[PDB]
Amino acid sequence: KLKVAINGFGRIGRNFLRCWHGRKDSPLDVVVVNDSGGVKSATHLLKYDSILGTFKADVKIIDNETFSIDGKPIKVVSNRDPLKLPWAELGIDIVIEGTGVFVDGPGAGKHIQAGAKKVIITAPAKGSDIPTYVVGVNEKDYGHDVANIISNASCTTNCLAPFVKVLDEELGIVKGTMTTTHSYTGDQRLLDASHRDLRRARAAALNIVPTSTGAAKAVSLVLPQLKGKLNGIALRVPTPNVSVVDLVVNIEKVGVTAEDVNNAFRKAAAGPLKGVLDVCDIPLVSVDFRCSDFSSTIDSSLTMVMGGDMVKVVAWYDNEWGYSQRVVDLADLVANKWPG
Amino acid sequence: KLKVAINGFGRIGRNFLRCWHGRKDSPLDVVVVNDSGGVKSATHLLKYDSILGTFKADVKIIDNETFSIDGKPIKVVSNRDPLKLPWAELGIDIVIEGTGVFVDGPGAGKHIQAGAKKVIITAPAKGSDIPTYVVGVNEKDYGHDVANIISNASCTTNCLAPFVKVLDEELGIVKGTMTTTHSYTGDQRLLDASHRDLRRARAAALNIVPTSTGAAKAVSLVLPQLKGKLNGIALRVPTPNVSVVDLVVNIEKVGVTAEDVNNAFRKAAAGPLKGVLDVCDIPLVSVDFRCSDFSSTIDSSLTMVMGGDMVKVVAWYDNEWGYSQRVVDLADLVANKWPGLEGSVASGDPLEDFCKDNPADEECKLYE
Amino acid sequence: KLKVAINGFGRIGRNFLRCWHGRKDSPLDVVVVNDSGGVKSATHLLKYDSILGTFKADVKIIDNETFSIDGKPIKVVSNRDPLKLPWAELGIDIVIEGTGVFVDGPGAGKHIQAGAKKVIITAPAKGSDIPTYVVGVNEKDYGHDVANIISNASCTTNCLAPFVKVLDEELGIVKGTMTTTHSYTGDQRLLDASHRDLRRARAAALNIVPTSTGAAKAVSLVLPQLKGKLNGIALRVPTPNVSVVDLVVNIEKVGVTAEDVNNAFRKAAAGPLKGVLDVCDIPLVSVDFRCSDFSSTIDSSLTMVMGGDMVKVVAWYDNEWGYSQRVVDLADLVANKWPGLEGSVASGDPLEDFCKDNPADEECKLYE
Amino acid sequence: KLKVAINGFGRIGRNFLRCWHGRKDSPLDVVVINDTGGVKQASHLLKYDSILGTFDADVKTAGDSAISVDGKVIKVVSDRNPVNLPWGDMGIDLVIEGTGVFVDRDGAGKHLQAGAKKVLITAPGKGDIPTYVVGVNEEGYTHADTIISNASCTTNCLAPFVKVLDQKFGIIKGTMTTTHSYTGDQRLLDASHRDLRRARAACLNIVPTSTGAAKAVALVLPNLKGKLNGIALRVPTPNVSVVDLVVQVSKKTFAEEVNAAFRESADNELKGILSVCDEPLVSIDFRCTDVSSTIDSSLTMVMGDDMVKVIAWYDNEWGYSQRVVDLADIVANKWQX
Amino acid sequence: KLKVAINGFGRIGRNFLRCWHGRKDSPLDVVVINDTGGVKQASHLLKYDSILGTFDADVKTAGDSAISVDGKVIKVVSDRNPVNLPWGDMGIDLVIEGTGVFVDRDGAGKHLQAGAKKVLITAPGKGDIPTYVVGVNEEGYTHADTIISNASCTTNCLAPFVKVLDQKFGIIKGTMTTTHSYTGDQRLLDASHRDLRRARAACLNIVPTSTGAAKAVALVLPNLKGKLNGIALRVPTPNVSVVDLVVQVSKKTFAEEVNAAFRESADNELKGILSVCDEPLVSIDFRCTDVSSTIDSSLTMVMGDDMVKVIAWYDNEWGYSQRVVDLADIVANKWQX
Ligand SMILES: NC(=O)c1ccc[n+]([C@@H]2O[C@H](COP(=O)([O-])OP(=O)(O)OC[C@H]3O[C@@H](n4cnc5c(N)ncnc54)[C@H](O)[C@@H]3O)[C@@H](O)[C@H]2O)c1
Ligand SMILES: NC(=O)c1ccc[n+]([C@@H]2O[C@H](COP(=O)([O-])OP(=O)(O)OC[C@H]3O[C@@H](n4cnc5c(N)ncnc54)[C@H](O)[C@@H]3O)[C@@H](O)[C@H]2O)c1
Ligand SMILES: NC(=O)c1ccc[n+]([C@@H]2O[C@H](COP(=O)([O-])OP(=O)(O)OC[C@H]3O[C@@H](n4cnc5c(N)ncnc54)[C@H](O)[C@@H]3O)[C@@H](O)[C@H]2O)c1
Ligand SMILES: NC(=O)c1ccc[n+]([C@@H]2O[C@H](COP(=O)([O-])OP(=O)(O)OC[C@H]3O[C@@H](n4cnc5c(N)ncnc54)[C@H](O)[C@@H]3O)[C@@H](O)[C@H]2O)c1
Ligand SMILES: NC(=O)c1ccc[n+]([C@@H]2O[C@H](COP(=O)([O-])OP(=O)(O)OC[C@H]3O[C@@H](n4cnc5c(N)ncnc54)[C@H](O)[C@@H]3O)[C@@H](O)[C@H]2O)c1
The H or E element that residue B121 is part of is strand B118-121
- Closest listed residue to residue D329, CA positions, set D39, D151, D184, D120: D120
Alpha carbon distance C336, A26 (integer Å): 65
Alpha carbon distance A237, A318 (integer Å): 13
Q: Give Dmax (Cα) for chain A.
A: 62
DSSP state of A237: B
| Contact status of C362 with chain D (Cβ, < 8 Å) | yes
Cβ B187 vs Cβ D33: under 8 Å: no
Alpha carbon distance B321, B225 (integer Å): 28
Q: How many CB atoms lie within 10 A of CB B191?
A: 26
Alpha carbon distance B40, C13 (integer Å): 54
The residue in chain E having the minimum alpha-carbon distance to the alpha carbon of residue B48 is E285
The CA-CA-CA angle for residues C105, C106, C107, to 5°, reads: 90
For ligand 4, atom 30, name the residue with the nearest CA.
Answer: D80
C29 is in an annotated binding site: no
Spatial CB neighbours of B203, under 8 Å, sequence gap ≥ 6: B188, B189, B190, B191, B192, B193, D50
Name C75's bridge partners: C66
Which subunits count as partners of chain E given 3+ CB pairs below 8 Å? A, B, D
Cβ C248 vs Cβ C229: under 8 Å: no
Cβ C245 vs Cβ C156: under 8 Å: yes
Spatial CB neighbours of E233, under 8 Å, sequence gap ≥ 6: E177, E178, E179, E180, E206, E207, E208, E209, E244
- State how far the alpha carbon of E151 is from the alpha carbons of A59, E211, E240, E294, in Å: 40, 10, 16, 17
Return the SS3 of C270.
helix
The torsion angles phi and psi of A86, rounded to 5 degrees, stand at -80, 85
Tell me whether residue C71 is exposed, middle or buried, using C-beta atoms within 10 angstroms of its C-beta: 0 to 12, 13 to 18, 19 or more: exposed
The residue in chain E having the minimum alpha-carbon distance to the alpha carbon of residue A50 is E190
Alpha carbon distance D44, D59 (integer Å): 9
Give DSSP secondary structure letters for D61-103. -SSSS---SSS---EEE----TTTSTTTTTT-SEEEE-SSTT-
Name E104's bridge partners: E126
Name E30's bridge partners: E4
- Closest listed residue to residue B277, CA positions, set B131, B137, B120: B137
Q: Could you identify the atom of ligand 5 that is nearest to the CA of residue E78?
A: 33
Cβ E156 vs Cβ E213: under 8 Å: no
- Closest listed residue to residue C17, CA positions, set C123, C100, B368, C44: C44
Alpha carbon distance C225, C170 (integer Å): 12
Instruction: Identify which of D190, D208, D235 has the shortest CB distance to residue E299.
Output: D208
**E319-334 exposure pattern, b = at least 16 Cβ within 10 A, e = fewer:** bbbbbbbbbbbbbbee
Alpha carbon distance B356, B350 (integer Å): 9
- What Rg, from alpha-carbon coordinates, does chain A have? 19
- What Rg, from alpha-carbon coordinates, does chain B have? 21
Active-site annotation holder among D153, D157, D277, D288: D153
End-to-end, the C-alpha distance of chain D in Å comes to 13
End-to-end, the C-alpha distance of chain E in Å comes to 13
The H or E element that residue D321 is part of is helix D318-332
CA distance D196 to chain E (A): 6
Question: Could you tell me where the DSSP H helices lie in chain C?
Answer: 11-22, 39-47, 105-113, 155-166, 258-270, 286-289, 321-336, 348-357
Alpha carbon distance C4, D293 (integer Å): 66
Q: Tell me the residue ranges of DSSP E strands in chain C.
A: 5-7, 32-34, 66-68, 73-75, 94-97, 118-121, 149-151, 173-176, 179-182, 212-213, 232-236, 243-246, 249-251, 277-280, 296-299, 315-317
Ligand nearest to the CA of B318: 2
Q: State this model's resolution in angstroms.
A: 8.9
Alpha carbon distance B123, B146 (integer Å): 19
- A and C adjacent (3 or more CB pairs under 8 angstroms): no
Interface of A with D in 188-227 (CB under 8 A): none
The residue in chain D having the minimum alpha-carbon distance to the alpha carbon of residue B183 is D189
Position C207: which residue type?
N
- Closest listed residue to residue A65, CA positions, set A47, A85, A49, A51: A85
Which of B188, B189, B190, B191 to mutate for ligand 4's pocket (most ligand atoms within 8 Å of CB)?
A: B191
- State how far the alpha carbon of C30 is from the alpha carbons of C21, C93, C114, in Å: 8, 10, 16
Position A274: which residue type?
K
The torsion angles phi and psi of A20, rounded to 5 degrees, stand at -45, -45
Alpha carbon distance C216, C233 (integer Å): 8
A236 is in an annotated binding site: yes
The torsion angles phi and psi of B217, rounded to 5 degrees, stand at -95, 10
Q: Give Dmax (Cα) for chain D.
A: 62
The helix-helix angle for D255-268 and D153-163 (nearest 10°) equals 110
Cβ A155 vs Cβ A326: under 8 Å: yes
Cβ E163 vs Cβ E174: under 8 Å: no
- State how far the alpha carbon of E266 is from the alpha carbons of E159, E262, E320, in Å: 13, 6, 16
Kindly list the residues from chain E whose CB atom is less than 8 angstroms away from the CB atom of residue B48: 279, 281, 284-285
**A182-201 exposure pattern, b = at least 16 Cβ within 10 A, e = fewer:** bbbbbbbbbbbbbeebebbb
The torsion angles phi and psi of C74, rounded to 5 degrees, stand at -130, 120
Spatial CB neighbours of A214, under 8 Å, sequence gap ≥ 6: A124, A153, A154
Position C273: which residue type?
L
Alpha carbon distance C141, C222 (integer Å): 9
Spatial CB neighbours of D183, under 8 Å, sequence gap ≥ 6: B191, D11, D234, D238, D316, D317
The torsion angles phi and psi of E88, rounded to 5 degrees, stand at -100, -5
The torsion angles phi and psi of A209, rounded to 5 degrees, stand at -115, 80
| Contact status of E307 with chain D (Cβ, < 8 Å) | yes
DSSP state of B250: E
Return the SS3 of B158.
helix
Position D190: which residue type?
D
Known catalytic residue at E153: yes
Alpha carbon distance E211, B317 (integer Å): 40
Dihedral angle over CA of C276, C279, C285, C288, nearest 10: -50
A45/E190 CB distance under 8 A? yes
The CB of A210 under 6 Å from ligand 1? The reply is no
DSSP state of B281: -
- Closest listed residue to residue D149, CA positions, set D160, D137, D157, D166: D137
Q: Is the Cα dihedral A181, A182, A184, A188 positive or negative?
A: negative
CA distance D281 to chain A (A): 8
The torsion angles phi and psi of B93, rounded to 5 degrees, stand at -75, -45
Tell me whether residue A24 is exposed, middle or buried, using C-beta atoms within 10 angstroms of its C-beta: 0 to 12, 13 to 18, 19 or more: exposed
| Contact status of D197 with chain E (Cβ, < 8 Å) | yes
The H or E element that residue A95 is part of is strand A94-97
**A215-249 exposure pattern, b = at least 16 Cβ within 10 A, e = fewer:** bbbbbbbbbeebeebbbbbbbbbbbbbbbbbbbbb
A239 is in an annotated binding site: no
- What Rg, from alpha-carbon coordinates, does chain C have? 21
Alpha carbon distance D313, D320 (integer Å): 12
The number of C-beta contacts closer than 8 angstroms across C and D is 45
The CB of C12 under 6 Å from ligand 3? The reply is yes
For ligand 4, atom 26, name the residue with the nearest CA.
Answer: D8
Which subunits count as partners of chain C given 3+ CB pairs below 8 Å? B, D
Spatial CB neighbours of E79, under 8 Å, sequence gap ≥ 6: E34, E36, E85, E86
Q: How many CB atoms lie within 10 A of CB A112?
A: 21
The H or E element that residue B245 is part of is strand B243-251
Tell me whether residue B65 is exposed, middle or buried, using C-beta atoms within 10 angstroms of its C-beta: 0 to 12, 13 to 18, 19 or more: middle
Alpha carbon distance D26, C231 (integer Å): 76
- Closest listed residue to residue B183, CA positions, set B119, B235, B109, B254: B235
Q: Tell me the residue ranges of DSSP E strands in chain D.
A: 2-4, 6-7, 28-30, 32-34, 48-49, 53-54, 75-77, 94-97, 118-121, 147-149, 171-174, 178-181, 208-209, 232-235, 241-249, 274-277, 293-296, 301-303, 307-314
For ligand 5, atom 6, name the residue with the nearest CA.
Answer: E152
Return the SS3 of B353.
helix
- What Rg, from alpha-carbon coordinates, does chain E have? 19
The CB of B13 under 6 Å from ligand 2? The reply is yes
The CA-CA-CA angle for residues B264, B268, B269, to 5°, reads: 105
Give DSSP secondary structure letters for D241-289. EEEEEEEEESS---HHHHHHHHHHHHHHTSBTTEEEE--S--HHHHTT-
Position C275: which residue type?
G
Cβ C43 vs Cβ C348: under 8 Å: no
Cβ C114 vs Cβ C120: under 8 Å: no
Q: Give Dmax (Cα) for chain E.
A: 61
CA distance B37 to chain D (A): 5
Q: How many CB atoms lie within 10 A of CB D83?
A: 16
Alpha carbon distance A258, A163 (integer Å): 14
Cβ E99 vs Cβ E82: under 8 Å: no
Side by side, the strands of the sheet bearing C315-317 are C212-213, C232-236, C179-182, C243-246, C315-317, C296-299, C277-280
Cβ C65 vs Cβ C77: under 8 Å: yes
Cβ C103 vs Cβ C97: under 8 Å: yes
Alpha carbon distance C328, C152 (integer Å): 10
Alpha carbon distance E273, E266 (integer Å): 8
CA distance D155 to chain E (A): 19
Spatial CB neighbours of B37, under 8 Å, sequence gap ≥ 6: B9, B45, B76, B78, D191, D192
The H or E element that residue B66 is part of is strand B66-69
Alpha carbon distance C65, C75 (integer Å): 5
Spatial CB neighbours of A24, under 8 Å, sequence gap ≥ 6: none
- Closest listed residue to residue E18, CA positions, set E331, E312, E313, E287: E287
Alpha carbon distance B318, B297 (integer Å): 9
Percentages of chain B per state (helix, strand, coil), in multiples of 5:
30, 25, 45
The CB of C114 under 6 Å from ligand 3? The reply is no
Alpha carbon distance D325, D26 (integer Å): 9
The CA-CA-CA angle for residues D328, D100, D229, to 5°, reads: 85
Cβ E301 vs Cβ D175: under 8 Å: yes
- E and A adjacent (3 or more CB pairs under 8 angstroms): yes
- State how far the alpha carbon of D331 is from the alpha carbons of A70, A125, C19, in Å: 40, 61, 70
Q: How many CB atoms lie within 10 A of CB D128?
A: 10
Percentages of chain D per state (helix, strand, coil), in multiples of 5:
25, 25, 50
Cβ C269 vs Cβ C166: under 8 Å: yes
Kindly list the residues from chain E whose CB atom is less than 8 angstroms away from the CB atom of residue B287: 48-50, 53
Regarding beta strands C179-182 and C243-246, do their DSSP bridges make them parallel or antiparallel, or are they unpaired?
antiparallel
Alpha carbon distance A44, A30 (integer Å): 17
CA distance D88 to chain A (A): 34
Question: B240 C-alpha to center of ligand 2: Å?
Answer: 15
Alpha carbon distance C147, C133 (integer Å): 10
Alpha carbon distance B176, D221 (integer Å): 65
DSSP state of B341: G
Spell out the SS3 assignment of chain E: CEEECEECCCHHHHHHHHHHHHCCCCCEEECEEECCCCHHHHHHHHCEECCCEECCCCCCCCCCCCCCECCECCEEECCCCCCCCCCCCCCCCEEEECCCCCCEHHHHHHHHHCCCCEEEECCCCECCCCECCCCCCCCCCCCCCCEEECCCHHHHHHHHHHHHHHHHHCEEEECCCEEEECCCCCCCCCCCCCCCCCCCCCCCCCCEECCHHHHHHHHHCCCCCCCECCCEEEECCCCCEEEEEEEEECCCCCHHHHHHHHHHHHHHCCECCEEEECCCCCHHHHCCCCCCEEEEHHHCEEECCCEEEEEEEECCCHHHHHHHHHHHHHHHCCCCC
Alpha carbon distance B23, B33 (integer Å): 17
Position A18: which residue type?
R
Position D327: which residue type?
L
- B and D adjacent (3 or more CB pairs under 8 angstroms): yes
Alpha carbon distance B148, B129 (integer Å): 9
